With several copies, the nearest count.
Chain A
Amino acid sequence: AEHVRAPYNGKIKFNEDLVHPTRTRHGHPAFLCYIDLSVIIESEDIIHSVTIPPKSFLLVQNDQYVESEQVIAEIRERVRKYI
């Protein structure tokens, strides 16, 4: 797997109606992306775009504030557990 990280600080912008809600293997809510979604980060100087390829998890929300180098998306034996 490959992790997409934010190249700048700023505000995430995308249309949440273009993606499908899901629960990740870590128990978090997220979005499933089956298209070439365009995600915008508006930083302190300029506005920058990150292309989200299909079959990828979008871990952030629209209008969320992200920090640089923070994971924002993920491009994508039987064990017994005792509690």
Chain B
Amino acid sequence: FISTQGWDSEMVVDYRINEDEFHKISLLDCDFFIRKPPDPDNDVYDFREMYVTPPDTDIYSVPRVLAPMPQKYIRCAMSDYGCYDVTEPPIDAPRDPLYKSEREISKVFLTKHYRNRRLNDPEFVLDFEEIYVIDSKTKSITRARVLVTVPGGRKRDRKDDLLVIRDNGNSFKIIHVGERDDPTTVIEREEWTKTREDMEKHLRKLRDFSVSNWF
């Protein structure tokens, strides 16, 4: 209907969109709207028209676009990125819960289906080279910069590659599925790096530090 492409990055629009012609993507600090062409699987996106709103509000504005956007329809799989906010709220009323567990979404990833194949297609794979990132803090949408380390180049067996996401959803690396790291290894690497720096900082103020070894 409307092409918001090339429009202001934060100005409000005069109208209220019909929300059932759009994908509604809810993040911690915004609602992101991307036009939805009709499709039985409901996973086709029209990025030419996009809006962003404060949560549970109907006052729409054009989001900041930090990368070139797809021009034709594309099929994408959606996954969210964030944390659990598990709290222990104060107990005011009788039988007030001992904890509250809520999910806080800071980023949403839209991963293109390879050649736009459907989920139920027997040849369905994801195209990790084309990923679009919605950020809640900046109310923006961008394309991820992906580093491919799999040998094969553009023409390769996409059934063998694994996407690794690190650094608050900012680093994207495609590796071979045989180079998969154990979850224990991932956790222990992070702990070793942090405790190694903290220990050296603690030991730095000892006056014989410069004539001592790590071991």
Contact = CB atoms under 8 A, between A and B. Distances in A.
B52 to A, nearest CB: 43
A9 B207 contact: yes
Interface residues of A, number: 9
Interface in B182-215: 204-207, 209-210
Contacts, number: 16
Contact of B206 (A43, A44, A45, A68): A68
Interface residues of B, number: 6
Task: Specify the main secondary structure of chain B where it touches its partner.
Answer: loop
Contacts of A9: 207, 210
A53 interface: no
B207 A45 contact: no
Contacts of B210: 9, 43-45
A7 B205 contact: yes
Nearest to A45: B210
Nearest to B209: A68
Given A7-B205, A8-B205, 14 more contacts: A7-B204, A8-B204, A9-B207, A9-B210, A43-B210, A44-B210, A45-B210, A67-B207, A68-B205, A68-B206, A68-B207, A68-B209, A69-B205, A69-B207
15 contacts: A7-B204, A7-B205, A8-B204, A8-B205, A9-B207, A9-B210, A44-B210, A45-B210, A67-B207, A68-B205, A68-B206, A68-B207, A68-B209, A69-B205, A69-B207
